[PDB]
Paper text:
Its ectodomain has three glycosylation sites and contains multiple EGF-like domains, which usually has a two-stranded β-sheet followed by a loop region and three conserved disulfide bonds. Here, we solve the crystal structures of the N-terminal fragments of human [name], which show that [name] forms homodimers and its epidermal growth factor (EGF)-like domains adopt a long-curved conformation.
Among them, two fragments (f1, 20–132aa and f2, 20–221aa) were crystallized and the crystals diffracted to 2.2 Å and 2.6 Å, respectively. The crystal of f1 fragment belongs to space group P212121 with two molecules per asymmetric unit. The f1 crystal structure contains a number of loops and two stranded β-sheets stabilized by hydrogen bonds and disulfide bonds, which is consistent with the typical feature of EGF-like domains, and it adopts a bow-like conformation with the middle part (~55–102aa) protruding outward. The electron density of the N-terminal end (~21–62aa) of one molecule in an asymmetric unit is relatively weak and some residues are missing, probably due to the flexibility of this region. In the crystal of f1 fragment, two molecules in an asymmetric unit are related by a twofold non-crystallographic symmetry axis. At the dimeric interfaces of f1 and f2 fragments, hydrogen bonds are formed between S88 and Y94 of the monomers, and F82 and Y94 are also close to each other, thus may form π-π interaction. Two salt bridges are also observed in f1 crystals between two monomers, one is between D61 and K71, the other is between R76 and D98. But the salt bridges are not found in f2 crystals, suggesting they are not required for dimerization. By contrast, mutant Y94A, where the hydrogen bonds and the π-π interactions between Y94 and F82 were both removed, showed a significant elution volume shift and the volume corresponded to the molecular weight of the monomeric [name] ectodomain, suggesting that the π-π interactions between F82 and Y94 were important for dimerization.
Author numbering:
A (entry chain B): 20 to 133
B (entry chain A): 21 to 25, 28 to 132
The structure:
Amino acid sequence: SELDPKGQHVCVASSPSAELQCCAGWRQKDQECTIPICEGPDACQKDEVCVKPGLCRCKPGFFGAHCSSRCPGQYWGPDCRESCPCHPHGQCEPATGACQCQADRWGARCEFPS
Amino acid sequence: ELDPKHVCVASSPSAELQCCAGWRQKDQECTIPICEGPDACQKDEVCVKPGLCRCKPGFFGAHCSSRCPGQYWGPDCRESCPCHPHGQCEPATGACQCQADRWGARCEFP
């Protein structure tokens, strides 16, 4: 896939080819450069994920000093940084946020019974 | 005023001292991280590392309103409390408050 010049963290090589490349600290996904890079002395430890160039946080759905505590149900994402909108009638997939309703609930936020 | 002890030296010919990128002085050294612009810290967050905000000590979660469980202290619960469950740790410093008739740095003695 090729890079969108209007995409996130896309830069231009100042080499004479002047072709599109990810800006420093980012890697390409599809048409933009939205994968942060954590390498060298800032490489992410076990049970951590890279969230910003050179910055790691506990993996999605976990928090704590060893990234081993499970987020309570009202949160998702790394370090529980995201709010789960279907709590308490469901819980959110830790990495995507997608709602998993309890047994007899439905709706985008699990707001409806039966 | 500035101690050459996160202190850097300017690229200019003045060869004067300055805080290294991302840090500010509060006294004689530069140990205040900088959180600015789009990386400014929200309510109940603190800047801990340049361009990084975390929930204030003893709290975590999307609105930094959940209190850490007892085995942790510090911002976003990043620190381990060595005296849990025989004591509790001060959220910002970690200092143990041992339970009744317990002692030691980690409340390890009955």
